[PDB]
Amino acid sequence: DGVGSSSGNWHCDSQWLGDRVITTSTRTWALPTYNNHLYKQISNSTSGGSSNDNAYFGYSTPWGYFDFNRFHCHFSPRDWQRLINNNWGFRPKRLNFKLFNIQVKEVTDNNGVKTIANNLTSTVQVFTDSDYQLPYVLGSAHEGCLPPFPADVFMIPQYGYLTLNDGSQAVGRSSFYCLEYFPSQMLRTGNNFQFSYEFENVPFHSSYAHSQSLDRLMNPLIDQYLYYLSKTINGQQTLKFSVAGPSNMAVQGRNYIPGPSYRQQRVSTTVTQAAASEFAWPGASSWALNGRNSLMNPGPAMASHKEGEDRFFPLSGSLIFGKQGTGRDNVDADKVMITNEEEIKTTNPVATESYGQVATNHQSAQAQAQTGWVQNQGILPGMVWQDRDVYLQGPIWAKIPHTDGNFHPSPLMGGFGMKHPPPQILIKNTPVPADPPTAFNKDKLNSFITQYSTGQVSVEIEWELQKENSKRWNPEIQYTSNYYKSNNVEFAVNTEGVYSEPRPIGTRYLTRNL
Amino acid sequence: DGVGSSSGNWHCDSQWLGDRVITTSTRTWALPTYNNHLYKQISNSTSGGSSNDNAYFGYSTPWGYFDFNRFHCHFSPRDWQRLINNNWGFRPKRLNFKLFNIQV
Amino acid sequence: DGVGSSSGNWHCDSQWLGDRVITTSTRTWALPTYNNHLYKQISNSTSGGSSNDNAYFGYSTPWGYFDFNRFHCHFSPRDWQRLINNNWGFRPKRLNFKLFNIQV
Amino acid sequence: DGVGSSSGNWHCDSQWLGDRVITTSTRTWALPTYNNHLYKQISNSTSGGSSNDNAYFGYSTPWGYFDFNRFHCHFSPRDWQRLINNNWGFRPKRLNFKLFNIQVKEVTDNNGVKTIANNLTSTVQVFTDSDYQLPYVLGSAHEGCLPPFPADVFMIPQYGYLTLNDGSQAVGRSSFYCLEYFPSQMLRTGNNFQFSYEFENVPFHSSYAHSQSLDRLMNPLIDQYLYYLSKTINGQQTLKFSVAGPSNMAVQGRNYIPGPSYRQQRVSTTVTQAAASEFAWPGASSWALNGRNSLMNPGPAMASHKEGEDRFFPLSGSLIFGKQGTGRDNVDADKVMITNEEEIKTTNPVATESYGQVATNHQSAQAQAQTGWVQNQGILPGMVWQDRDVYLQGPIWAKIPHTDGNFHPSPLMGGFGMKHPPPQILIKNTPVPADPPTAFNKDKLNSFITQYSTGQVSVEIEWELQKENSKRWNPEIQYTSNYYKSNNVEFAVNTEGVYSEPRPIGTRYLTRNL
């Protein structure tokens, strides 16, 4: 429109209908100039790294991008509490995104002092990768998302991507992408940008915990009409059979079995434990691709620990969040928040235990029957399992890789897997050259006016709800704040205005039968 | 239009139809003041040259000009590869040119 | 039709449309008499083999069969090169089969 | 149709309308099996040749082809005489082609004796290269065309083609063509084949000889209003000028000049001439392509000899036809018929003479004026020329090479140049395998029944005529037979039934002004 007219209003609210909840969040963003308007080839050689498992090749772009792939970007703690305490499931339906109130500033430095002024004629470029023609980086748990607290002003992360690499070198199959080779809208201070997106059909997330275990689905009062091998010896091959009943539930015939497993090493959170060695990488569970070892993290959805063993967690089978103010490198256990998936112990195997035992020979009068531990078990017919729970500060969705085949493409870090997820939204400040020389020079200009941009961003997502119809008589487990006095209110600001999330919040508090 | 409204968008893409390919390219340009707004007579004497095969007379203008008479101004390397590997011939048909987002 | 009239023509060509390619191939075949018009029980004993991993039982028929389950039966090397250099994917859609010019 | 019904009639006649003549010719052909149904790579190594100018790479196909690219295939000598004596020009308009009365035979040899019988169920395959996707070999003066005498039965020539070569080896750019990769009609004894072709617009062939010379177009009674430099010296630079008039026609100003030239070495047909050396290749005029020397033959259309010098002919600037029964290698001059282009001496330069003289220096008081002979002269503005004449036994058309540029694409051997000439008509006997083994073998069959095919071929061509409207008073030169007694009639059969063409017949007997 014009310089003196706002191009949008501040929309931040949650609307709770019967089977739907609509979340709207608005944030103020700041966008600097990245790479000084240049594309730069990057690799482990340019970052000084030399281990082959950490080798890479790719490019850093002068473009930024908008990321809102975390639940706390849309749900307040109270809204999250309502969702998890009142619904058996939820899933995103549609998306509305807006950019408005664009403000481009120029920075001039004379001597140790910088002056900031408006550049009303400068432009900012925005486009969406609706055709998914660029590498998708929103499927990784990267920082730079919209802040959970609406009052926080955030910096737009720089967009970068990786391609095929051989050590620090590239190959002929490696691809280079120029983001200026895409049509993009150019916005001055009076312009705004908006688009709508429809989520593809995805299953409802399981925001419930099973009230029954897979091995306890039988009637505890009635025998089965099936027999099991009880005895074998007299005290001669004396085969004896008995009815499987309530007194021996472990040997009863069952129609379904627990889901797959990929065993994790076990770590205790108890201080004054002596470790026998440094094992964080040597003892790690891991998968190899083209000679590169990657850590299995978080791996298949498995129960974090057995009943009563909350002190143990899988070495890399659980999401680890950092508390507010936590450092980047080598922080203590009390500075991080270790999530656990104990709710899925009713259907999924324990992460730090073998799946089971399998016969490994033919027993005879000369050879005793032998069994072997199954540390990793693939998918078998009749298996049932629960996917990893999602969290308030955890990811929402991920892009299913474009491959010939996949099985249960639920993101392993939690969330909804989609072939066509919300498109990447890329933003960049248009370069503004400084005064050029009065004589023609064919070289590309390298002198630009120092600029940055700021504005507001709004994203609205409609969520579909799956209401609970339980006939359970006794009250359910519910997420609740603790009344006991404390120096600060949980999920609030401190005396210095710092917002903090004191604990990870799952979704599985209500119960339903298996 | 106005100071605070963009006068055009960034269009840079290639569209491949059956018998036609449409190339669009957008660039950012900078234009200084040439000759301090003056027209100047130029010659090999003003550039100090004295061989007769290199002798000339003419004028330098304060005007600039836009030139896109090179194939890489319109075709990306991948588009060029497609064109050369899949076609026995090609020729230009029509042109569209735009100047926008003027900043003085 | 008749003895002196051909029952079909030689069709062997590839037609490249926008999103579709139609491949046609014609070959000359010869069919002898198999097993002297008999069905015969066959096994690893009749072929003299005695390893259990290679043991088998079955039948050999006096019938022949037409097989075109290889890509080079339909795509020339140039057509294959075009397909692989210009397309992200392909799949068969429909089939037409003909036998003609029978000569016994 | 059926075995016992003819699929076509014998059509061989010429119909003379006002401005059009329609020629129809029917011939009986025989088609054997070529290369034993195989494609074979051929090169100068496979033929034992080692000179680099003669090096080649290509393929021989089992297909034959029909060729009617000679005028005597359509015009009888009397029709040719009428055409050349009554018309100033002619050009082909449209084409009709027919194959019918197909007869396929099988040959069986027991012991030194062969038995031939009909194979009523066998097929012959015919198709036309209407899209010009195969190498065009009809543009060369090859043998194998339809015989001039309708009663002669001819053998179908085998189709072969050449591609890019480096010595006897091929390169990556070389192309291999499979003629079975084309849709073709399969014909039994009851079937027939036919198609129609329309000639693209071509200029009328010049079937006239100019009655004026390019240097004698002025009025012989009136002076020009232009002056020429007559004198220079006194006997001091004394420049003298004179009017160019009838007394000095050589110095008169002229608007047009003779056409281009590429000088030929001169050879005398007179016996008992002593040659100074072997010069047939060392003295030859020639052009080089990629390091290979090719003879300039017949080269640009130039006058064969000056007036009264019929004994001389250019070394390779004239078409040479062989008399009936003439051998293939090293025959005497009396066994060949040397064509001449003396009719174009009025506009074209003499083949064995320089185009002219050009100044080569600046004359002065110290240096005498110098001139140099122009042995080769390219196209200049104002040039006019006549193309090479066509002959009864000479070629009719040729395919203009598909190139970015060309100038006056009239075939240098004579005829009409076309981007889309009459398409190649390719024919092959369908292989008929012998008895295969009773056990499956994956190798391609190499045992086939010995077969050949025979039938009739008809081609009808409509020619457009350009009538003469001359006001010449005295009678014209006309082609005529000689009444004087001879043992045989010219253009007739001998006592052994051998048809012969005793002389080449041009088309340029009538006259018109320049």
Side-chain angles (χ1 to χ4, degrees):
Chain A
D1 189 12
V3 177
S5 181
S6 181
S7 58
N9 293 321
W10 189 280
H11 297 103
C12 190
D13 190 8
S14 63
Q15 186 177 4
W16 286 86
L17 285 86
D19 65 329
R20 286 156 48 254
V21 50
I22 301 179
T23 61
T24 309
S25 59
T26 302
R27 302 293 189 273
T28 299
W29 52 265
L31 178 66
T33 294
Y34 282 119
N35 290 346
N36 202 266
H37 315 275
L38 295 178
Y39 287 77
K40 295 183 177 181
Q41 165 187 318
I42 61 178
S43 62
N44 57 279
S45 177
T46 69
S47 68
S50 300
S51 52
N52 184 253
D53 297 332
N54 294 300
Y56 69 91
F57 184 102
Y59 299 91
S60 60
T61 71
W63 292 73
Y65 66 98
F66 287 95
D67 193 3
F68 46 87
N69 197 12
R70 302 180 72 176
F71 278 104
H72 60 184
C73 309
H74 318 271
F75 288 96
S76 65
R78 175 52 188 160
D79 291 317
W80 192 257
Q81 181 185 31
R82 282 191 283 257
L83 169 67
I84 66 179
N85 288 342
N86 300 122
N87 297 271
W88 268 352
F90 64 97
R91 60 182 182 183
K93 299 299 295 182
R94 40 187 47 85
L95 187 152
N96 181 266
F97 181 86
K98 289 186 177 58
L99 294 181
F100 54 94
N101 294 333
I102 303 301
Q103 309 160 60
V104 193
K105 305 287 187 177
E106 57 180 0
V107 182
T108 58
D109 185 8
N110 197 336
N111 44 326
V113 47
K114 52 178 58 181
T115 302
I116 303 179
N118 292 280
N119 193 319
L120 307 176
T121 60
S122 42
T123 61
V124 182
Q125 305 175 225
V126 182
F127 74 99
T128 62
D129 189 14
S130 301
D131 296 333
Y132 309 97
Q133 296 168 313
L134 290 173
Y136 201 82
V137 302
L138 302 182
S140 303
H142 286 302
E143 296 278 6
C145 300
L146 271 60
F149 196 54
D152 292 1
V153 182
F154 73 105
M155 177 178 176
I156 295 182
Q158 182 182 3
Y159 175 76
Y161 60 92
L162 299 176
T163 181
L164 302 184
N165 70 282
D166 188 5
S168 62
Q169 293 177 333
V171 296
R173 199 172 294 119
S174 300
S175 302
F176 169 70
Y177 297 96
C178 178
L179 273 63
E180 284 72 12
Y181 196 47
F182 291 79
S184 60
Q185 180 181 346
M186 308 187 68
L187 295 76
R188 291 193 171 181
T189 58
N191 304 122
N192 51 14
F193 171 80
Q194 53 185 287
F195 78 97
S196 298
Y197 165 80
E198 305 291 334
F199 285 85
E200 73 183 37
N201 202 326
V202 293
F204 289 96
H205 173 76
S206 59
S207 73
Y208 58 85
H210 289 296
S211 59
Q212 289 182 300
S213 60
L214 193 53
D215 54 356
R216 295 295 183 269
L217 299 181
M218 73 292 295
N219 193 329
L221 310 176
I222 309 299
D223 296 330
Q224 289 183 333
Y225 52 82
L226 302 174
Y227 284 74
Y228 71 98
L229 184 61
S230 47
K231 228 176 278 183
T232 273
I233 48 172
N234 270 332
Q236 204 47 37
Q237 189 165 352
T238 55
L239 293 186
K240 299 296 181 178
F241 300 87
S242 301
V243 177
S247 63
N248 198 342
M249 297 181 175
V251 303
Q252 292 192 15
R254 294 177 173 86
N255 292 322
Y256 300 95
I257 58 178
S261 62
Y262 199 89
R263 186 174 183 177
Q264 288 285 337
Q265 183 54 267
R266 192 175 67 170
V267 189
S268 184
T269 59
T270 286
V271 184
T272 77
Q273 284 287 313
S277 64
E278 174 47 59
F279 71 84
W281 178 260
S285 307
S286 84
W287 46 271
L289 188 63
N290 195 21
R292 292 202 299 257
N293 283 328
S294 177
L295 182 67
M296 183 64 94
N297 180 26
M302 294 176 298
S304 299
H305 54 267
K306 298 185 298 180
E307 193 74 25
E309 292 188 353
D310 307 327
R311 73 190 172 279
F312 300 111
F313 68 105
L315 174 59
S316 68
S318 61
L319 299 182
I320 313 299
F321 296 101
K323 296 181 177 178
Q324 186 65 214
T326 301
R328 187 184 187 273
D329 303 324
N330 295 118
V331 300
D332 290 326
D334 57 358
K335 302 297 179 58
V336 297
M337 302 177 298
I338 298 180
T339 62
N340 58 270
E341 306 293 330
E342 63 91 10
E343 296 85 2
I344 69 181
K345 75 170 68 64
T346 57
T347 56
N348 298 28
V350 183
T352 61
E353 298 289 343
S354 302
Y355 179 84
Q357 303 180 250
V358 61
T360 58
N361 70 327
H362 289 163
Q363 58 87 18
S364 62
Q366 308 85 5
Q368 183 174 313
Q370 299 180 174
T371 55
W373 300 101
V374 179
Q375 318 290 2
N376 57 317
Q377 177 56 59
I379 287 294
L380 295 172
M383 278 189 171
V384 296
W385 66 90
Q386 291 293 93
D387 297 331
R388 186 176 302 272
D389 191 10
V390 301
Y391 298 89
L392 177 60
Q393 53 273 87
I396 301 181
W397 71 81
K399 181 180 179 301
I400 303 175
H402 185 89
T403 59
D404 292 325
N406 64 81
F407 180 82
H408 200 75
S410 181
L412 292 182
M413 292 188 297
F416 308 90
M418 289 179 288
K419 290 290 186 178
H420 307 283
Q424 296 178 299
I425 311 167
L426 294 148
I427 183 177
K428 186 194 67 176
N429 299 328
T430 302
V432 177
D435 51 323
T438 56
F440 170 75
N441 192 277
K442 65 176 183 59
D443 302 329
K444 63 175 184 178
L445 303 183
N446 61 333
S447 182
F448 300 94
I449 299 180
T450 302
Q451 280 189 332
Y452 73 97
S453 60
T454 181
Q456 279 71 56
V457 49
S458 297
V459 46
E460 186 181 31
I461 298 185
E462 175 179 343
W463 311 79
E464 187 179 10
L465 303 183
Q466 175 176 321
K467 311 303 297 180
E468 58 93 8
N469 197 85
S470 178
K471 301 296 297 181
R472 170 170 169 169
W473 184 264
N474 54 319
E476 298 265 34
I477 297 182
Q478 304 279 79
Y479 179 82
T480 173
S481 299
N482 301 330
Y483 175 81
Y484 190 78
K485 54 184 177 180
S486 60
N487 293 19
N488 307 281
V489 177
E490 293 186 353
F491 297 93
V493 296
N494 197 16
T495 58
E496 284 71 30
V498 177
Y499 180 83
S500 62
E501 292 173 322
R503 71 188 78 263
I505 306 180
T507 62
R508 295 167 172 164
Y509 293 86
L510 298 178
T511 59
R512 74 191 304 176
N513 294 324
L514 182 54
Chain B
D1 189 12
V3 177
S5 181
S6 181
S7 58
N9 293 321
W10 189 280
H11 297 103
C12 190
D13 190 8
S14 63
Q15 186 177 4
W16 286 86
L17 285 86
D19 65 329
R20 286 156 48 254
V21 50
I22 301 179
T23 61
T24 309
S25 59
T26 302
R27 302 293 189 273
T28 299
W29 52 265
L31 178 66
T33 294
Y34 282 119
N35 290 346
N36 202 266
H37 315 275
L38 295 178
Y39 287 77
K40 295 183 177 181
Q41 165 187 318
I42 61 178
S43 62
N44 57 279
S45 177
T46 69
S47 68
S50 300
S51 52
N52 184 253
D53 297 332
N54 294 300
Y56 69 91
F57 184 102
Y59 299 91
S60 60
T61 71
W63 292 73
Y65 66 98
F66 287 95
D67 193 3
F68 46 87
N69 197 12
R70 302 180 72 176
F71 278 104
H72 60 184
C73 309
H74 318 271
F75 288 96
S76 65
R78 175 52 188 160
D79 291 317
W80 192 257
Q81 181 185 31
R82 282 191 283 257
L83 169 67
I84 66 179
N85 288 342
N86 300 122
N87 297 271
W88 268 352
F90 64 97
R91 60 182 182 183
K93 299 299 295 182
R94 40 187 47 85
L95 187 152
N96 181 266
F97 181 86
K98 289 186 177 58
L99 294 181
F100 54 94
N101 294 333
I102 303 301
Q103 309 160 60
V104 193
Chain C
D1 189 12
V3 177
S5 181
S6 181
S7 58
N9 293 321
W10 189 280
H11 297 103
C12 190
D13 190 8
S14 63
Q15 186 177 4
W16 286 86
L17 285 86
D19 65 329
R20 286 156 48 254
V21 50
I22 301 179
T23 61
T24 309
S25 59
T26 302
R27 302 293 189 273
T28 299
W29 52 265
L31 178 66
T33 294
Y34 282 119
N35 290 346
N36 202 266
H37 315 275
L38 295 178
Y39 287 77
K40 295 183 177 181
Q41 165 187 318
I42 61 178
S43 62
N44 57 279
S45 177
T46 69
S47 68
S50 300
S51 52
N52 184 253
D53 297 332
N54 294 300
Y56 69 91
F57 184 102
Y59 299 91
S60 60
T61 71
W63 292 73
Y65 66 98
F66 287 95
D67 193 3
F68 46 87
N69 197 12
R70 302 180 72 176
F71 278 104
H72 60 184
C73 309
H74 318 271
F75 288 96
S76 65
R78 175 52 188 160
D79 291 317
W80 192 257
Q81 181 185 31
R82 282 191 283 257
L83 169 67
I84 66 179
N85 288 342
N86 300 122
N87 297 271
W88 268 352
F90 64 97
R91 60 182 182 183
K93 299 299 295 182
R94 40 187 47 85
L95 187 152
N96 181 266
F97 181 86
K98 289 186 177 58
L99 294 181
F100 54 94
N101 294 333
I102 303 301
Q103 309 160 60
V104 193
Chain D
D1 189 12
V3 177
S5 181
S6 181
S7 58
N9 293 321
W10 189 280
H11 297 103
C12 190
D13 190 8
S14 63
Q15 186 177 4
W16 286 86
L17 285 86
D19 65 329
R20 286 156 48 254
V21 50
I22 301 179
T23 61
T24 309
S25 59
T26 302
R27 302 293 189 273
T28 299
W29 52 265
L31 178 66
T33 294
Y34 282 119
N35 290 346
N36 202 266
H37 315 275
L38 295 178
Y39 287 77
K40 295 183 177 181
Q41 165 187 318
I42 61 178
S43 62
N44 57 279
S45 177
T46 69
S47 68
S50 300
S51 52
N52 184 253
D53 297 332
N54 294 300
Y56 69 91
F57 184 102
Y59 299 91
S60 60
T61 71
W63 292 73
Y65 66 98
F66 287 95
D67 193 3
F68 46 87
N69 197 12
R70 302 180 72 176
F71 278 104
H72 60 184
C73 309
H74 318 271
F75 288 96
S76 65
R78 175 52 188 160
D79 291 317
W80 192 257
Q81 181 185 31
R82 282 191 283 257
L83 169 67
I84 66 179
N85 288 342
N86 300 122
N87 297 271
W88 268 352
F90 64 97
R91 60 182 182 183
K93 299 299 295 182
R94 40 187 47 85
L95 187 152
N96 181 266
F97 181 86
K98 289 186 177 58
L99 294 181
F100 54 94
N101 294 333
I102 303 301
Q103 309 160 60
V104 193
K105 305 287 187 177
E106 57 180 0
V107 182
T108 58
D109 185 8
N110 197 336
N111 44 326
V113 47
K114 52 178 58 181
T115 302
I116 303 179
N118 292 280
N119 193 319
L120 307 176
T121 60
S122 42
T123 61
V124 182
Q125 305 175 225
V126 182
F127 74 98
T128 62
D129 189 14
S130 301
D131 296 333
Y132 309 97
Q133 296 168 313
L134 290 173
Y136 201 82
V137 302
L138 302 182
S140 303
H142 286 302
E143 296 278 6
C145 300
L146 271 60
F149 196 54
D152 292 1
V153 182
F154 73 105
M155 177 178 176
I156 295 182
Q158 182 182 3
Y159 175 76
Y161 60 92
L162 299 176
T163 181
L164 302 184
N165 70 282
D166 188 5
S168 62
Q169 293 177 333
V171 296
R173 199 172 294 119
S174 300
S175 302
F176 169 70
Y177 297 96
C178 178
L179 273 63
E180 284 72 12
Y181 196 47
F182 291 79
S184 60
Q185 180 181 346
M186 308 187 68
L187 295 76
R188 291 193 171 181
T189 58
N191 304 122
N192 51 14
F193 171 80
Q194 53 185 287
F195 78 97
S196 298
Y197 165 80
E198 305 291 334
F199 285 85
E200 73 182 37
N201 202 326
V202 293
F204 289 96
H205 173 76
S206 59
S207 73
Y208 58 85
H210 289 296
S211 59
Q212 289 182 300
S213 60
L214 193 53
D215 54 356
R216 295 295 183 269
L217 299 181
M218 73 292 295
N219 193 329
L221 310 176
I222 309 299
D223 296 330
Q224 289 183 333
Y225 52 82
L226 302 174
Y227 284 74
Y228 71 98
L229 184 61
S230 47
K231 228 176 278 183
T232 273
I233 48 172
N234 270 332
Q236 204 47 37
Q237 189 165 352
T238 55
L239 293 186
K240 299 297 181 178
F241 300 87
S242 301
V243 177
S247 63
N248 198 342
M249 297 181 175
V251 303
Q252 291 192 15
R254 294 177 173 86
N255 292 322
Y256 300 95
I257 58 178
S261 62
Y262 199 89
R263 186 174 183 177
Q264 288 285 337
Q265 183 54 267
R266 192 175 67 170
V267 189
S268 184
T269 59
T270 286
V271 184
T272 77
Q273 284 287 313
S277 64
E278 174 47 59
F279 71 84
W281 178 260
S285 307
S286 84
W287 46 271
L289 188 63
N290 195 21
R292 292 202 299 257
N293 283 328
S294 177
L295 182 67
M296 183 64 94
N297 180 26
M302 294 176 298
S304 299
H305 54 267
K306 298 185 298 180
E307 193 74 25
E309 292 188 353
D310 307 327
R311 73 190 172 279
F312 300 111
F313 68 105
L315 174 59
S316 68
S318 61
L319 299 182
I320 313 299
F321 296 101
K323 296 181 177 178
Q324 186 65 214
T326 301
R328 187 184 187 273
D329 303 324
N330 295 118
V331 299
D332 290 326
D334 57 358
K335 302 297 179 58
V336 297
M337 302 177 298
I338 298 180
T339 62
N340 58 270
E341 306 293 330
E342 63 91 10
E343 296 85 2
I344 69 181
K345 75 170 68 64
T346 57
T347 56
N348 298 28
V350 183
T352 61
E353 298 289 343
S354 302
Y355 179 84
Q357 303 180 250
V358 61
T360 58
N361 70 327
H362 289 163
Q363 58 87 18
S364 62
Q366 308 85 5
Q368 183 174 313
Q370 299 180 174
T371 55
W373 300 101
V374 179
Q375 318 290 2
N376 57 317
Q377 177 56 59
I379 287 294
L380 295 173
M383 278 189 171
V384 296
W385 66 90
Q386 291 293 93
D387 297 331
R388 186 176 302 272
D389 191 10
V390 301
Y391 298 89
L392 177 60
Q393 53 273 87
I396 301 181
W397 71 81
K399 181 180 179 301
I400 303 175
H402 185 89
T403 59
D404 292 325
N406 64 81
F407 180 82
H408 200 75
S410 181
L412 292 182
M413 292 188 297
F416 308 90
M418 289 179 288
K419 290 290 186 178
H420 307 283
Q424 296 178 299
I425 311 167
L426 294 148
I427 183 178
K428 186 194 67 176
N429 299 328
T430 302
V432 177
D435 51 323
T438 56
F440 170 75
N441 192 277
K442 65 176 183 59
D443 302 329
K444 63 175 184 178
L445 303 183
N446 61 333
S447 182
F448 300 94
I449 299 180
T450 302
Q451 280 189 332
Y452 73 97
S453 60
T454 181
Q456 279 71 56
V457 49
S458 297
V459 46
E460 186 181 31
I461 298 185
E462 175 179 343
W463 311 79
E464 187 179 10
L465 303 183
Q466 175 176 321
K467 311 303 297 180
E468 58 93 8
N469 197 85
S470 178
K471 301 296 297 181
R472 170 170 169 169
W473 184 264
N474 53 319
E476 298 265 34
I477 297 182
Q478 304 279 79
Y479 179 82
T480 173
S481 299
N482 301 330
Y483 175 81
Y484 190 78
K485 54 184 177 180
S486 60
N487 293 19
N488 307 281
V489 177
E490 293 186 353
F491 297 93
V493 296
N494 197 16
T495 58
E496 284 71 30
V498 177
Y499 180 83
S500 62
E501 292 173 322
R503 71 188 78 263
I505 306 180
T507 62
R508 294 167 172 164
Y509 293 86
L510 298 178
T511 59
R512 74 191 304 176
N513 294 324
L514 182 54

